[PDB]
Design an enzyme around this catalytic site. Structure first.
Site, mmCIF file in Angstrom:
data_model
loop_
_atom_site.group_PDB
_atom_site.id
_atom_site.type_symbol
_atom_site.label_atom_id
_atom_site.label_comp_id
_atom_site.label_asym_id
_atom_site.label_seq_id
_atom_site.Cartn_x
_atom_site.Cartn_y
_atom_site.Cartn_z
ATOM 1 N N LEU G 36 27.606 42.284 -30.684
ATOM 2 C CA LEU G 36 27.259 42.867 -31.971
ATOM 3 C C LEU G 36 27.892 42.061 -33.100
ATOM 4 O O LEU G 36 28.717 41.172 -32.878
ATOM 5 C CB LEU G 36 27.707 44.330 -32.043
ATOM 6 C CG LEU G 36 27.204 45.247 -30.925
ATOM 7 C CD1 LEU G 36 27.687 46.667 -31.146
ATOM 8 C CD2 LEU G 36 25.699 45.207 -30.831
ATOM 9 N N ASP G 37 27.486 42.379 -34.325
ATOM 10 C CA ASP G 37 28.075 41.763 -35.510
ATOM 11 C C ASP G 37 28.444 42.824 -36.536
ATOM 12 O O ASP G 37 28.162 44.003 -36.347
ATOM 13 C CB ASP G 37 27.122 40.740 -36.122
ATOM 14 C CG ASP G 37 25.691 41.196 -36.097
ATOM 15 O OD1 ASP G 37 25.082 41.321 -37.178
ATOM 16 O OD2 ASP G 37 25.166 41.419 -34.987
ATOM 17 N N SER G 38 29.065 42.391 -37.624
ATOM 18 C CA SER G 38 29.690 43.292 -38.575
ATOM 19 C C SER G 38 28.798 44.446 -39.022
ATOM 20 O O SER G 38 29.292 45.590 -39.166
ATOM 21 C CB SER G 38 30.126 42.499 -39.798
ATOM 22 O OG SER G 38 30.960 41.465 -39.369
#
Ligand SMILES: CCCCCCCCCCCCCCCCCC(=O)OC[C@H](COP(=O)([O-])OCC(O)COP(=O)([O-])OC[C@@H](COC(=O)CCCCCCCCCCCCCCCCC)OC(=O)CCCCCCCCCCCCCCCCC)OC(=O)CCCCCCCCCCCCCCCCC
Ligand SMILES: CCCCCCCCCCCCCCCCCC(=O)OC[C@H](COP(=O)([O-])OCC[N+](C)(C)C)OC(=O)CCCCCCCCCCCCCCCCC
Ligand SMILES: CCCCCCCCCCCCCCCCCC(=O)OC[C@H](COP(=O)(O)OCCN)OC(=O)CCCCCCCCCCCCCCCCC
Ligand SMILES: CCCCCCCCCCCCO[C@@H]1O[C@H](CO)[C@@H](O[C@H]2O[C@H](CO)[C@@H](O)[C@H](O)[C@H]2O)[C@H](O)[C@H]1O
Ligand SMILES: CCCCCCCCCCCCO[C@@H]1O[C@H](CO)[C@@H](O[C@H]2O[C@H](CO)[C@@H](O)[C@H](O)[C@H]2O)[C@H](O)[C@H]1O
Ligand code: SF4
Ligand code: SF4
Ligand code: SF4
Lengths: 112, 155, 176, 207, 94, 114, 76, 115
Positions: G36-38
């Site tokens: 995942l990312d921010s």
């Protein structure tokens, strides 16, 4: 006594001579904390003292208004309040200090 | 004869519609001032049966009287859609006709006919009040030529 | 100098006070306003009977454009493009070439009448009185394309309207 | 008094010059240049940090009383590293005089909102933000004012094209007005007008 | 102009004015729509001598602004205080 | 290299403003679809919001990030108060524009634009 | 109710489709393990605010990177 | 009968006009045409949201005053009574108390709308 100043929202002042003396004296006191050699102090003391002289030596409102050349005496009171507000603000700004920064080389050159 | 009857019925509804044209109280810019002068006593558009009504629900004609900008375009299309039918659009002035003096602006619609169908184009900047009246009478003669019932009969 | 529009003190004598009471109760100043509209009812209306009657105009009126000729029938326009250069709307488009007899004449001369602002700068700029705004203002059309004039349309306008245009120029050319 | 030449008013030029150095003496922390044109208009060029001190002084000082903000605008000069020049035009009813105050900024530097000095400045700053993209700090309500909702770009910049990038039409399929890349049936015709001969020697720049 | 006498009286009375002296419809007091040709005057520069353009060239007298101060005694105001207006002697109060 | 900040003093402070804006947009999409009566789903609306944030992922200047957030807040305010109309909301989806293929050959066949 | 929170939090992380349930553990880091990312993490934090019905400031939210660290957070 | 026949005829005539109005014209219905009107832009919020009433106190006073006229409308008949001393006193009494109640509401600023 004036029934109306003619300017909407500007109430007639019952005691304009004393009010002007209070305000100019307050303006002079505030200028005391400005440096002596600051041009704002020297100029504002000069013109503030001229108005204080004219208020003291002239008891008639109409004749005083003619001397001051500031419009209604209520207009002159408002200007004194404005000058007093500016003098306080000048103390925090200190614009008598040297120029904060020169502009870039050709910032004000016109035409380009 | 069926044809004779529908021909006469076409004349009646065509006469009623052109004799009673209610423009929407809709103006955009300078051209609306000449539109005001058509309602004024010299031309008295009311005397032809032409009456302004504010509500689009009660309007028969949209006179686009002035520049149509991009910000205004969705609103003009909205009030046009909200007119009951039959409905007509008269394009008044160069701005409405095709952009006019502002044709090359980033914020102007180059002709209101990109947004709505247009029945009559009144040229000028602005068209005189008499030129707009000529355009309205031209719209009337267009309505007089309609053949709705005649075409329905031959469907 | 200045004046006061609304700085007056009503008088308080019993007659004036009653005069105002009668005004308040009997609606005298509202009745007075009814009198004005009544007088207008019996004035002849200002309406003219268009299209049988027409609003007055002057020789300077700026209407539909037209390209003019000399008395011989030769075109006045010599494709200088001054009208095209001055047009505030960029409504004019021109192309030109030597004619088969060598004359300097246009092969394209378009006016987009939906761009034009009917300002008359083109006829001021023309050095030979070739492009004019004529007196016609009754030329509304049913389609947009009908207002994109090319040279053939503009020449036909000149031939159609030259009788009026020449007389209008005769009346006003000494002010130009 | 040559009939076709604008006359000179030397009294005004002297008066405005005197007041010009009067302002420079009082606000040396900010004033960078003072000039008076040949048609008697006084301009004060200041560092942007002095927008509030300088404008407050001109409004409130008893020898200035510039109570009315006639106009507040911006000019885009791309060749400057601070491309935007912000121009305040002020009017003094007491002394029947006008003064122009000018400062500068770039695309990423905020200017202090002068609404606290002149309530008139509210919409003028919204226009400057809208048309030039200059951000005004502490503005009560800064948002577009002239351009269409969601419009992208700042049209009054010199490098924004005249006809923009998108145009509108009604599309029957989606039953709404849509925006699409701009195509012109007739491209605007760029004219090269400047004569190659100098007109005004008085303004010649050094080589 | 074509109103009968009684109708003129009625509308005169209703409005409280004599409406016939200043009718809002134009009749024959207006100018003729055809006029004699004009002969317009010329300007002060229409001369054959003593008329060199360099002595009447306003644009070439425009100068760059005077720099009063650059970053390279009594107080003053921008101009004298404005004189107070006087009341109209034509009609001071409306 | 010493410049006046807009809001954030550094990218770490800026990224906080970005995240708060993303939350505000993320929360609002269900309201936008319902109020404007759009025919897209909340997933499409939120995917589009993600697409708009992603295109600016490479910015490393805090002042540029601050201006992008300021405009993002303005755009959100226009939507929440229904100053925008349905046409303005749907402009993000370019529904009426035909695909322009990005391969060399496809461009070559259609014109001279690179 | 600590025991139940490990089920509530894992209930949400399973709904968030981008997560693969087989790859998900109470200690799977959103960035390195789950991919995942921010912004995905921000979306996860918003879903948590719904089930537990309270606000998680950004200063608080950014520290929560594993399903466990949220449980520790909810406890307070 | 005459009365019921007259009412039925009037309201039937009105109903027929509506029936013709809906079934005679050619219709073309689509979403944008039937959308609520608000000067070209879509409405912000339902028209069913509460609409504050600034004359709420006059509205309640209307109820009380509207019943007073029910008490007064019999006065033309009451004037046929032989006991005119009582009737005149009670008629004037009722109207004065109406005036007193009006004067009270006026002096207490009940007739000014809430701002
Ligand atoms: C119900 C009511 C209707 C039924 C009553 C019918 C009465 C007959 C009306 C006939 C009017 C025709 C006049 C005429 O001959 O045309 C002259 C006209 C030529 O005259 P002109 O050269 O143009 O100059 C006109 C006058 O100089 C300029 O006009 P003027 O303003 O000077 O008027 C002239 C004349 C015109 O008036 C009449 O002749 C008719 C008067 C009827 C009064 C009813 C009210 O009036 C008078 O001379 C003064 C007496 C009129 C009574 C005025 C009192 C007004 C009310 C008081 C004010 C307060 C009101 C509140 O010829 C026509 O154009 C014919 C047009 C036909 C018009 C329609 C006539 C039929 C009307 C309907 C009939 C019933 C249906
Ligand atoms: C105080 C009250 C005043 C009442 C005024 C009453 C009006 C009196 C004048 C009537 C004129 C005749 C009606 C014609 C107008 C019809 C509207 C129209 O333009 O349609 C075009 C349409 C055109 O249709 P079209 O087939 O050509 O195309 C439309 C379809 N598209 C969009 C795809 C193109 O005409 C018709 O469809 C039928 C025309 C028939 C005309 C005869 C009307 C018969 C009336 C019975 C209708 C049935 C309902 C009963 C209503 C009560 C009966 C009185
Ligand atoms: C023997 C003892 C006898 C005892 C009994 C004696 C009784 C008679 C004496 C009592 C006084 C008689 C007059 C009473 C009439 C009503 C007067 C009235 O109500 O007017 C006041 C009203 C308010 O005016 P305003 O100035 O706005 O406010 C006052 C300050 N608060 O002003 C208004 O109403 C303004 C109305 C505006 C709308 C007017 C639009 C129409 C105007 C033209 C109508 C002309 C009248 C035609 C009548 C036709 C009748 C069929
Ligand atoms: C807030 C409370 C306010 C209360 C106000 C009450 C006001 C009442 C005022 C008195 C009204 C009636 O006033 C009274 O009417 C009767 C008849 O109508 C009169 O009576 C007169 O006519 C009647 C018959 O019509 C005869 O029987 C009688 O001999 C004769 O004197 C009285 O002479 C008069 O004094
Ligand atoms: C028997 C029936 C006939 C008798 C009259 C009965 C009705 C009496 C009405 C009220 C009389 C006294 O009560 C009322 O008080 C208020 C004070 O706020 C006054 O009202 C005051 O403010 C209002 C609004 O600006 C205005 O009416 C007026 O400018 C001023 O007088 C009224 O002038 C006075 O009339
Ligand atoms: S066409 Fe001319 S008059 Fe009409 S709105 Fe445009 S600029 Fe104004
Ligand atoms: S009238 Fe003006 S706008 Fe029209 S073609 Fe001539 S110069 Fe151009
Ligand atoms: S200015 Fe006259 S001669 Fe020159 S191109 Fe135009 S119409 Fe022709």
């Amino acid at each position: 006594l004036k029934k109306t100043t003619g300017l909407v929202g500007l109430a007639v002042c019952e005691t304009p001579h004393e009010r002007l003396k209070i305000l100019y004296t307050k303006i002079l006191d505030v200028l005391g904390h400005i440096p002596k050699n600051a041009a704002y102090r020297k100029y504002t003391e000069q013109i503030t003292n001229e108005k204080l002289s004219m208020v003291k030596a002239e008891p008639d409102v109409k004749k005083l208004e003619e001397r001051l050349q500031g419009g209604q005496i209520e207009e002159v009171i408002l200007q004194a309040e404005n000058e007093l507000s500016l003098a306080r603000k000048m103390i925090q700004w200190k614009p008598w200090e040297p120029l904060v920064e020169e502009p870039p080389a050709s910032q004000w050159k016109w035409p380009i | 004869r069926g044809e004779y009857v529908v021909a006469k019925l076409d004349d009646l509804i065509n006469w009623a519609r052109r004799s009673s044209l209610w423009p929407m109280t809709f103006g955009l810019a300078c051209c609306a001032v000449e539109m005001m002068h058509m309602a004024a006593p010299r031309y008295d558009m009311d005397r032809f049966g032409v009456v302004f009504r504010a509500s689009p629900r009660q309007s028969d004609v949209m006179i686009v009287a002035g520049t149509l900008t991009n910000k205004m375009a969705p609103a003009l299309r909205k009030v046009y859609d909200q007119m009951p039918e039959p409905r007509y659009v008269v394009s008044m002035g160069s701005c409405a006709n095709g952009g006019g003096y502002y044709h090359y602006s980033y914020s102007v619609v180059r002709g209101c006919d990109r947004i709505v169908p247009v029945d009559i184009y009144v040229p000028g900047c602005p068209p005189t009040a008499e030129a707009l009246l000529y355009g309205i009478l031209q719209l009337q003669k267009k309505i007089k030529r309609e053949k709705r019932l005649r075409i329905w009969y031959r469907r | 100098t200045y004046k006061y529009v609304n700085l007056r003190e009503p008088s308080m004598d019993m007659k004036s006070v009653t005069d105002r009471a009668a005004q308040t109760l009997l609606w005298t100043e509202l009745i007075r306003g009814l009198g004005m509209t009544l007088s207008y009812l019996f004035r002849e209306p200002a309406t003219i009977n268009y299209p049988f009657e027409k609003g007055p105009l002057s020789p300077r009126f700026r209407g539909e454009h037209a390209l003019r000729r000399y008395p011989s029938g030769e075109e006045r326009c010599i494709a200088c493009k001054l009208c095209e250069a001055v047009c505030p709307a960029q409504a004019i488009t021109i192309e030109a070439e030597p004619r088969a007899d060598g004359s300097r004449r246009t092969t394209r001369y378009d006016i987009d009448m939906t761009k034009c602002i009917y300002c008359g700068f083109c006829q001021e700029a023309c050095p030979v009185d070739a492009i004019v705004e004529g007196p016609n203002f009754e030329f509304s059309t049913e389609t947009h394309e009908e207002l994109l004039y090319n040279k053939e349309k503009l020449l036909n306008n000149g031939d159609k309207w030259e009788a009026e245009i020449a007389a209008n120029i005769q009346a006003d050319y000494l002010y130009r | 008094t040559r009939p076709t030449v604008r006359p000179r008013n030397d009294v005004a030029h002297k008066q405005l010059s005197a007041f010009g150095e009067y302002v420079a003496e009082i606000l040396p922390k900010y004033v960078q240049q003072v000039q008076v044109s040949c048609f008697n208009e006084l301009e004060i060029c200041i560092h942007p940090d002095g927008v509030i001190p300088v404008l407050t002084f001109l409004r409130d000082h008893s020898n200035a009383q510039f109570k009315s903000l006639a106009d507040l605008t911006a000019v885009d000069i791309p060749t400057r590293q601070n491309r935007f020049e912000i121009v305040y035009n002020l009017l003094s009813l007491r002394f029947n005089s006008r003064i122009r105050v000018k400062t500068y900024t770039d695309e990423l530097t905020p200017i202090e909102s002068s609404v606290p000095v002149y309530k008139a400045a509210n919409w003028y700053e919204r226009e400057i933000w809208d048309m030039f993209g200059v951000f005004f700090a502490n503005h009560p309500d800064l948002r577009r004012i002239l351009t269409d909702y969601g419009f992208e770009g700042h049209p009054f910049r010199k490098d924004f094209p005249l006809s923009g990038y998108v145009e509108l039409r009604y599309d029957d399929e989606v039953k709404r007005v849509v925006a699409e890349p701009v195509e012109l049936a007739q491209e605007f015709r760029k004219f090269d007008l400047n004569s190659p001969w100098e007109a005004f020697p008085a303004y010649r720049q050094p080589p | 102009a074509s109103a009968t006498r009684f109708i003129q009286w009625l509308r005169n009375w209703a409005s409280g004015r004599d409406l016939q002296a200043k009718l809002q419809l134009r009749y024959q007091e207006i100018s003729k729509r055809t006029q004699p040709p004009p002969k317009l005057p010329v300007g002060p520069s229409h001369k054959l001598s003593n008329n060199y353009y360099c002595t009447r060239d306003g644009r070439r007298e425009a100068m760059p602004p005077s720099i009063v101060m650059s970053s390279q005694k009594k107080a003053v105001s921008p101009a004298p205080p404005i004189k107070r207006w006087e009341l109209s002697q034509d009609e001071p109060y409306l | 290299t010493s410049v006046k900040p807009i809001f954030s003093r550094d990218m770490n402070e800026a990224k906080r403003r970005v995240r708060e804006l993303y939350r505000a947009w993320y929360r609002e999409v269900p309201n936008t679809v319902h109020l404007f009566q759009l025919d897209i789903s909340v997933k499409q609306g939120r995917d589009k919001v993600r697409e708009m944030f992603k295109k600016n992922a490479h910015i490393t200047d805090p002042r540029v990030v601050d201006l992008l957030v300021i405009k993002g807040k303005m755009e959100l305010e226009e939507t929440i108060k229904v100053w925008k109309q349905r046409t303005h909301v749907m402009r993000f989806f370019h529904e009426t524009e035909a695909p322009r293929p990005k391969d060399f050959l496809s461009k070559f066949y259609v014109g001279h634009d690179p | 109710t600590l025991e139940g929170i490990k089920d509530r939090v894992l209930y949400v992380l399973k709904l968030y489709d981008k997560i693969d349930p087989e790859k998900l553990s109470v200690n799977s880091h959103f960035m390195k393990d789950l991919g995942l990312d921010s912004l995905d993490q921000v979306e996860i934090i918003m879903a948590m605010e719904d089930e537990f019905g309270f606000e998680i400031p950004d200063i608080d939210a950014e520290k929560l990177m594993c399903p466990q660290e949220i449980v520790d957070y909810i406890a307070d | 009968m005459n009365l019921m026949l007259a009412l039925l005829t009037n309201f039937t005539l009105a109903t027929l006009l509506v029936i013709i109005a809906f079934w005679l014209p050619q219709l073309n219905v689509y979403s944008e045409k039937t959308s609520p009107y608000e000067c070209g832009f879509d409405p912000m919020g339902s028209a069913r949201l509460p609409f504050s009433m600034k004359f709420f106190l006059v509205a309640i006073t209307f109820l009380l005053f509207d019943l007073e006229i029910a008490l007064l409308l019999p006065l033309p008949w009451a004037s046929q009574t032989a006991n005119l001393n009582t009737m005149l006193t009670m008629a004037l009494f009722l109207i004065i108390l109406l005036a007193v109640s009006l004067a009270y509401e006026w002096t207490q600023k009940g007739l000014e709308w809430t701002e």
